[PDB]
């Protein structure tokens, strides 16, 4: 992420501030978010996106 | 661990939509097999 | 000449209800969201609670819970006796007969983690009995419960 | 009238409740039921609130 958006500070600052440690975090929390109300798991928050 | 509270707050949410509701509250009893059917029925 | 239908059972006029500031809400102090919980089958609610049985039995269903949390721990204490028992045969195992280095930590690791696990159920089962003692220590009208 | 279907609706939902009260239901199903009702009493005096 900081090879390819690396440049701006604005990435940077997101970077350090976003806390999320982990591509399965992310992919969690963004299940958890986008489709609420239904048992997160790790095939239906891949190919959910 | 995170996953598992996950899973809590989610069902703890009300989701509006009535048929959506309904939806989840059926899900929650398993099926069964032949033999528990006969003695399921032999029951009742 | 008008008619009226008898519903089988109450329902709410929705102008009390959803109408910001809910008018319901406001006259019995309920949060919209609660009472949008209530009224479309959601979450229940408690009406009535009879405080003198509640502060009478306070001791008596104590008793009854200590009882029960006895039993618990004591079948918490059997479950961590069999993990000991478990794993005096996995170290005997291991260091009796030709193993790797690791291997005999391997599964005493393994061991040990699935008593993690049992430590684990059992920290469940204090949650579960000791969340609803203190709900019900707590429990007045007008109180939603989730989770049915 | 465009009304008389929302007054079927709420009768015929109200209908379908005594009948499921009457005959001996799991609490699922005359839940559910009764929800529906509200619903549809809800829909007669104002849609899409």
């Given at each position: 992420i900081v090879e390819r958006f690396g440049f701006s500070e604005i990435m940077r600052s997101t970077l350090e501030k976003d806390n999320t440690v982990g591509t399965d975090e992310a992919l969690l929390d963004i299940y958890r978010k986008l489709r609420p109300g239904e048992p997160p798991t790790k095939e239906s928050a891949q190919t959910l996106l | 661990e995170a996953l598992r509270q996950?899973?809590?707050?989610?069902?703890?949410?009300?989701?509006?939509?009535?048929?959506?509701?309904?939806?989840?509250?059926?899900?929650?009893?398993?099926?069964?097999?032949?033999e528990e059917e006969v003695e399921l029925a032999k029951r009742i | 000449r008008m008619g009226h239908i008898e519903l089988a059972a109450?329902?709410?006029?929705?102008?009390?209800?959803?109408?910001?500031?809910?008018?319901?809400?406001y006259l019995l102090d309920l949060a919209p969201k609660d009472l949008e919980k209530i009224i479309y089958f959601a979450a229940y609610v408690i009406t009535s609670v009879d405080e003198e049985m509640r502060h009478n039995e306070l001791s008596t269903?104590?008793?009854?819970?200590?009882?029960?949390?006895?039993?618990?721990?004591?079948?918490?204490?059997?479950?961590?006796?069999?993990?000991?028992?478990?794993?005096?045969?996995?170290?005997?195992?291991?260091?009796a007969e030709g193993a790797k280095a690791?291997?005999?930590?391997?599964?005493?690791?393994?061991?040990?983690?699935?008593?993690?696990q049992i430590?684990?159920?059992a920290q469940r089962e204090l949650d579960r009995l000791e969340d609803i003692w203190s709900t019900f220590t707590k429990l007045a009208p007008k109180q939603l419960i989730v989770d049915e | 009238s465009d009304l008389n279907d929302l007054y079927r609706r709420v009768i015929n939902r109200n209908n379908r409740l005594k009948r499921l009260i009457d005959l001996g239901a799991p609490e699922i199903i005359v839940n559910n039921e009764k929800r529906m009702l509200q619903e549809s009493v809800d829909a007669l005096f104002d849609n899409g609130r």
């Amino acid at each position: 992420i900081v090879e390819r958006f690396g440049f701006s500070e604005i990435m940077r600052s997101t970077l350090e501030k976003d806390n999320t440690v982990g591509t399965d975090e992310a992919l969690l929390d963004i299940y958890r978010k986008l489709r609420p109300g239904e048992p997160p798991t790790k095939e239906s928050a891949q190919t959910l996106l | 661990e995170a996953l598992r509270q996950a899973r809590k707050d989610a069902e703890l949410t009300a989701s509006a939509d009535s048929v959506r509701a309904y939806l989840k509250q059926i899900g929650k009893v398993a099926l069964l097999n032949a033999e528990e059917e006969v003695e399921l029925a032999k029951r009742i | 000449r008008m008619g009226h239908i008898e519903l089988a059972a109450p329902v709410t006029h929705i102008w009390y209800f959803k109408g910001v500031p809910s008018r319901l809400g406001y006259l019995l102090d309920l949060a919209p969201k609660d009472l949008e919980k209530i009224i479309y089958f959601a979450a229940y609610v408690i009406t009535s609670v009879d405080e003198e049985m509640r502060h009478n039995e306070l001791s008596t269903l104590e008793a009854e819970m200590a009882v029960e949390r006895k039993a618990v721990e004591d079948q918490r204490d059997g479950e961590l006796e069999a993990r000991a028992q478990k794993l005096e045969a996995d170290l005997a195992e291991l260091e009796a007969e030709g193993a790797k280095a690791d291997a005999r930590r391997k599964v005493r690791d393994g061991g040990e983690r699935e008593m993690r696990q049992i430590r684990d159920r059992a920290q469940r089962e204090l949650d579960r009995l000791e969340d609803i003692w203190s709900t019900f220590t707590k429990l007045a009208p007008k109180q939603l419960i989730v989770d049915e | 009238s465009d009304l008389n279907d929302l007054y079927r609706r709420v009768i015929n939902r109200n209908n379908r409740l005594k009948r499921l009260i009457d005959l001996g239901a799991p609490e699922i199903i005359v839940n559910n039921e009764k929800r529906m009702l509200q619903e549809s009493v809800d829909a007669l005096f104002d849609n899409g609130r």
